[PDB]
Write a protein that binds this DNA or RNA. Structure first.
Ligand SMILES: [Zn+2]
Ligand SMILES: [Zn+2]
Lengths: 77, 116, 107, 295, 49, 162, 50, 107, 184
RNA sequence: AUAGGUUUGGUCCUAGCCUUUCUAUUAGCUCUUAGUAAGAUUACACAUGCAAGCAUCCCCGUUCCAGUGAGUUCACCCUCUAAAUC
């Protein structure tokens, strides 16, 4: 694609960004949907983030982790 | 490379031939080529219908959970497929474009009845 | 080997390819083969076969015609055998030839 | 409680009935050939090699699990009537995972009714063979599994390989696996080559099928003709345990039948051609008077 | 509610670990706020050109 | 003929035929051995036959060999915590020392099997990538899915001829 | 590695020039109110703001 | 912890001509990919010694430093494992020149 | 037209014998190593080339899934591999037809091939899991409320509707329309 | 390499060169269809068209994609740790 130093073209030296016709009830019910979704997938994202953090923390230091560590050290001695 | 700024993105990568598409769910950095360096392939989506006809899709749901929990920004077709599946709530636009056709068929039903 | 009746064998000749040394060395080796019954008689042990096609099944091919030795064969760990670098190259996959396993006609 | 296929007593009995013919278990197969290796051993190490061959034959001769058919699943998880009418074709999905067992992973279907139905058994097997392929299974069902083709391999006496192909393609709890197995068993009962399925792992399965849906007449017939007599008795014993409310069983503990009698009893009680069973026992005992005179 | 498939895996996982525990898999939502499309940002997290 | 007395020692199956896979604590192995004397024959054969096998499997452990400096042959292990295990080898044999080090500072069969299991976890059967890493490259294969145009021409639902 | 002293010097004087002679808010968001074109920017405004 | 790659390295002292530093020579075994025989390869390491306790010819155990001191000093002395000539048998802690016991073990 | 007959006739034992059909043919080539592919077609148009190949020399030797003796002639006996085209001397056309015929005979049953005893796919053979048993149904599903109530259209207050109009007039589009139910 | 041709008056040995195989580009001569892969020689000079918008004004993006092979051990592992996404 183009860079910051490409002369802009003629065809786009003027071109109206005519915006889309806003319908009414679809716009508001669509907003109420967009906000509900962002909320529930945010909840799912927090669940997955805390699950990943749990996996990292129990793998680093859990109870079976300490168990196999102490078993290995005792076997070494 | 590095790519100044950016995040991971669970997205679809085209990998078929002409007139025969196929998307492989990939967890790649956003600032990377479409078909390029992916951190982990998370699944595959064959959109053409089978001989029996079942449009197969596949998902390492556990690894998708891991990468979402690591910070992957899921893209819109991935949100569509995950709604279709049931790992994510049905996407707003997949119900809104539904109601746009529902009323479009009606626009036809009435006009058709007037013709008859 | 079609005149002898040998149907399946691999052979590579190197050095000088003189026909009147090739035939003579071939006949020398093939007439100085050691057979399975002679090996069994010389060592006093059973000569048994292990094919990968059949499985772990032991197939006795030659038993001694005299007494059976009861001291087992000495398992000489790390045997002192003279190996061929071509064989080891083919085993390790560093034998790169565009001539080796070519699709040829029958026999 | 009735012992199933996997109880210790019945599993040992079925074992002896099978037999371990090493020259049939480990048999020359037409695969790719590598040059044979040779070893030099004494009698003791030859005996050790034969013992290890026997143990490996037991490992190869471990019995496949006979199991009951599976209830055809029809469980609608959800139904999105709003999505109904949007897409034309279905959309099957698989939690490929890596560590979840194949009978524990979630496979679902989304239909043009909006129904999020759980995937059927056949679709489940097809999906797991696509994403996790196992050597031998092709997701399109083999054409060899039909009437005329299966009969062709029956005529060419290929029943062990019929069962081998059935094992690879279909899961044991599936209907096809059961139908193909039972049709093969009815075929071999009709003509009768119990030596053809001997030393194979599918012998114990033919026995249970016959004893459970009782047709063990040809089994006893071949058993005694071929002097498999400790077998014959164990086979009756197994029938008597599997049907303990049979008049044969009642007469068995009444008459203290301990050997051949156990069989004669069966003939005089429930054998459909008990004249032939009893007659082959008299001929077997005529030959026994002969080799007892030889002894 | 959890989405249908995720609900099925959760109830199946605990069904497997043991306890039947047939309560519906609810998740808490009141932790998540509801800032709409009018809420303002910060000018150091911004940058004039 | 391959050069050397025992040509089997340079054959890449003998090297990956060893059994000692040192733990991640060992860093230095030092082998002090005596060239003459009937008692140090096990250490001499251990240097001759088994040191190549140890390094191929433990590739980052420094193995230094020292000749007739002490009147008794012995092995030493410098471990990352700071430890200095000493294993004398006088009146032993190379197989005996092999067993000895696999018991003392060598990983167990469960550990190497488990470490091996983690490796296979990467090559996943469902993945569809190029034949260097995966097993199938497109679903244009799995018979039942639409084939790759190249092999079987696509019906006239394709674009252009629409 | 040969030091990139010229690149570093150019970066530094570019940063100092940017810090010092930074264009101000007045000659930035000012507006030709008839054609909606800001100056030094040259881009007009979106359709929701005319 | 340490940013230095080599944690522990046993080496040999080459020179003590720099103040409070020993030039040491680590010898590791690298496999010839063709010949498949391990040949000793050497890397020079500069160890820090505070007490000037190592002379030339000693075998020394060098541990790493959390962060390099100089451009090349990345290691410090941990033990003069074997001191030139003055070598004490580790097995029997009795002095030994080489192959003979200067002081007897059955003391 | 119907095979399985010539190879049991007398002319097959007169021209050939107990020997292979392909055991008389030598492909002419630049000497030494043969080209590592046979011709693509002995029969171009309806004309036969100079050295017809083993299959293209006796029009009567038809190739299909039931000509079992010819199929076993072209497949090896000690190893279960199909003989390659330089080995046999057949064309790329016939070799392809022969591979098809051998395969069709193999899954039609009129050809013996070794099948390996496979090991079980899984270890646990249970069927007691959520994907292979029932799930306790959803409150919505025992009822008829849609999953996630935000899917159903619900008209907001006309105060919000007119606030929307105040935000977006001029380019405003048409009205709404509660979505239909059973679209045809 | 399953190897072959060639030193001589002839033989044996050593040996170079070439042949037989597979691929790629170009040249000659000549070429029916359909599908698909791939497609400057030149880091030489470029006419002309297009390739960066979005957006209630801020910002954000134009630092990416796409291209080339000039230069060339800035690509890998570990430690440490700054933008960045949660
Ligand atoms: Zn393809
Ligand atoms: Zn032909």
């Amino acid at each position: 694609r183009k860079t910051r130093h490409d002369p802009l073209a003629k065809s786009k030296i003027e071109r109206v960004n005519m915006p889309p016709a806003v319908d009414p009830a679809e716009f508001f019910v669509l907003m109420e949907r967009y906000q509900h979704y962002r909320q529930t997938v945010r909840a799912l994202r927090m669940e997955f983030v805390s699950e990943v953090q749990r996996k990292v923390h129990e793998a680093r230091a859990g109870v079976l982790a300490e168990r196999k560590a102490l078993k290995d050290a005792a076997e070494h001695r | 490379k590095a790519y100044r700024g950016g995040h991971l993105t669970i997205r679809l990568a085209l990998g078929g031939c002409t007139n025969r598409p196929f998307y492989r769910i990939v967890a790649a950095h956003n600032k990377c080529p479409r078909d390029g360096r992916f951190v982990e392939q998370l699944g595959s989506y064959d959109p053409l219908p089978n001989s029996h006809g079942e449009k197969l899709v596949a998902l390492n749901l556990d690894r998708i959970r891991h990468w979402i929990g690591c910070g992957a920004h899921l893209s819109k077709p991935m949100e569509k497929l995950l709604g279709l599946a049931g790992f994510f709530p049905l996407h707003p636009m997949m119900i809104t474009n539904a109601e746009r056709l529902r009323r479009k068929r009606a626009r036809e039903v009435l006009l058709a009845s007037q013709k008859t | 080997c079609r005149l002898i009746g040998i149907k399946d064998m691999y052979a590579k000749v190197s050095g000088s390819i003189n026909m009147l040394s090739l035939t003579q060395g071939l006949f020398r080796g093939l007439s100085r083969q050691e057979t399975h019954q002679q090996l069994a008689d010389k060592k006093g042990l059973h000569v048994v076969e292990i094919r990968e096609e059949c499985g772990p099944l032991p197939i006795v091919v030659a038993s001694p015609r005299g007494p059976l030795r009861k001291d087992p064969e000495p398992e000489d760990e790390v045997p002192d055998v003279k190996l061929d670098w071509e064989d080891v190259k083919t085993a390790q996959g560093m034998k790169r030839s565009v001539w080796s396993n070519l699709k040829r006609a029958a026999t | 409680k009735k012992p199933t296929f996997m109880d210790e007593e019945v599993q040992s009995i079925l074992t002896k009935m099978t037999g371990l013919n090493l020259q049939k278990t480990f048999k020359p197969a037409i695969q790719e050939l590598k040059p044979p290796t040779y070893k030099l051993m004494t009698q003791a190490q030859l005996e050790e090699a034969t013992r290890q061959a026997v143990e490996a034959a037991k490992v190869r001769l471990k019995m496949p699990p006979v199991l009951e058919e599976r209830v055809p699943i029809n469980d609608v998880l959800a139904e999105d009537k709003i999505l109904e009418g949007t897409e034309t074709t279905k959309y099957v999905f698989t939690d490929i995972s890596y560590s979840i067992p194949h009978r524990e992973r979630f496979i679902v279907v989304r239909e043009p009714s909006g129904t999020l139905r759980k995937a059927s058994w056949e679709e489940r097997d097809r999906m797991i063979q696509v994403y996790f392929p196992k050597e031998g299974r092709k997701i399109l069902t083999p054409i060899i599994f039909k009437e005329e083709n299966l009969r062709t391999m029956y005529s060419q006496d290929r029943h062990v390989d019929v069962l081998n192909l059935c094992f690879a393609q279909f899961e044991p709890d599936s209907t096809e696996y059961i139908k193909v197995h039972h049709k093969t068993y009815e075929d071999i009962d009709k003509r009768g080559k119990y030596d053809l399925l001997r030393s194979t792992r599918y012998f114990g399965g033919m026995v249970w099928y016959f004893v459970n849906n009782k047709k063990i007449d040809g089994l006893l017939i071949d058993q005694i003709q071929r002097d498999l007599i400790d077998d014959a008795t164990n086979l009756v014993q197994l029938y008597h345990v599997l049907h303990p409310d049979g008049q044969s069983a009642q007469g068995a503990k009444d008459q203290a039948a301990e050997g051949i009698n156990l069989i004669k009893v069966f003939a005089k009680t429930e054998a459909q051609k008990g004249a032939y069973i009893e007659l082959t026992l008299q001929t077997y005992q005529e030959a026994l008077s002969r080799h007892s005179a030889a002894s | 509610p959890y989405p249908p498939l995720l609900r099925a895996m959760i109830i199946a996982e605990r069904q497997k670990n043991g306890d039947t525990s047939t309560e519906e898999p609810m998740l808490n939502v009141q932790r998540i706020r509801m800032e709409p499309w009018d809420y303002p940002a910060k000018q150091e997290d911004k940058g004039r050109a | 003929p391959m050069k050397g007395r025992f040509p089997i020692r340079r054959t890449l199956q003998y090297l990956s035929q060893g059994n000692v896979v040192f733990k991640d604590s060992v860093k230095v192995m030092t082998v002090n051995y005596n060239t003459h004397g009937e008692l140090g024959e096990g250490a001499r054969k251990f240097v001759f036959f088994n040191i190549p096998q140890i390094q191929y499997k433990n590739p980052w452990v420094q193995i230094m060999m020292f000749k007739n400096m002490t009147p008794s042959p012995f092995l030493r292990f410098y471990l990352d915590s700071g430890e200095q295990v000493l294993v004398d080898v006088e009146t032993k044999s190379n197989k005996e020392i092999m067993e000895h080090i696999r018991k003392i500072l060598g990983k167990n069969e469960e550990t190497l099997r488990e470490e091996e299991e983690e490796k296979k976890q990467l090559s996943h059967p469902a993945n569809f990538g190029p034949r260097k890493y995966c097993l199938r490259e497109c679903i244009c294969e799995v018979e039942g899915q639409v084939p790759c145009p190249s092999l079987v021409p696509l019906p006239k639902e394709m674009r252009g001829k629409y | 590695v040969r030091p990139r002293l010229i690149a570093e010097l150019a970066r530094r004087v570019r940063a100092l020039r940017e810090q010092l002679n930074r264009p101000r808010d007045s000659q930035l968001y000012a507006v030709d109110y008839e054609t909606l074109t800001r100056p030094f920017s040259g881009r007009r405004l979106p359709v929701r703001a005319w | 912890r340490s940013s230095v790659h080599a944690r522990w390295i046993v080496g040999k002292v080459i020179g003590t001509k720099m103040q409070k530093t020993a030039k040491v020579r680590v010898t590791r075994l690298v496999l010839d990919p063709y010949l498949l025989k391990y040949f000793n390869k050497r890397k020079t390491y500069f160890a820090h010694d505070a007490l000037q306790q190592c002379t030339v010819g000693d075998i020394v155990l060098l541990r790493a430093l959390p962060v390099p001191r100089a451009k090349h000093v990345k290691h410090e002395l941990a033990e003069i494992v074997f001191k030139v000539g003055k070598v004490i048998d580790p097995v029997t802690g009795k002095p030994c020149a080489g192959t003979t016991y200067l002081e007897s073990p059955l003391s | 037209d119907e095979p399985w007959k010539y190879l049991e006739s007398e002319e097959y034992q007169e021209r050939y014998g107990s020997r292979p059909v392909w055991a008389d043919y030598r492909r002419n080539h630049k000497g030494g190593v043969p080209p590592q592919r046979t011709r693509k077609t002995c029969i171009r148009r309806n004309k036969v080339v100079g050295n017809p190949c083993p299959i293209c020399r006796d029009h009567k030797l038809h190739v299909d899934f039931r000509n079992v003796k010819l199929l076993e002639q072209f497949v090896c006996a000690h190893t279960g591999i199909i003989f390659y085209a330089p080995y046999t001397g057949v064309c790329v056309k016939q070799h392809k037809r022969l591979t098809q015929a051998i395969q069709k005979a193999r899954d039609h049953g009129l050809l013996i091939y070794h099948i390996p005893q496979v090991e079980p796919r899984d270890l646990d053979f249970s069927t007691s899991h959520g994907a292979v048993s029932a799930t306790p149904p959803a409150p919505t599903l025992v009822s008829g409320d849609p999953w996630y109530p935000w899917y159903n259209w619900k008209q907001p207050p006309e105060r919000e509707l007119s606030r929307l109009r105040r935000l977006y007039q001029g380019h405003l589009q048409e009205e709404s329309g509660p979505p239909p139910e059973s679209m045809p």
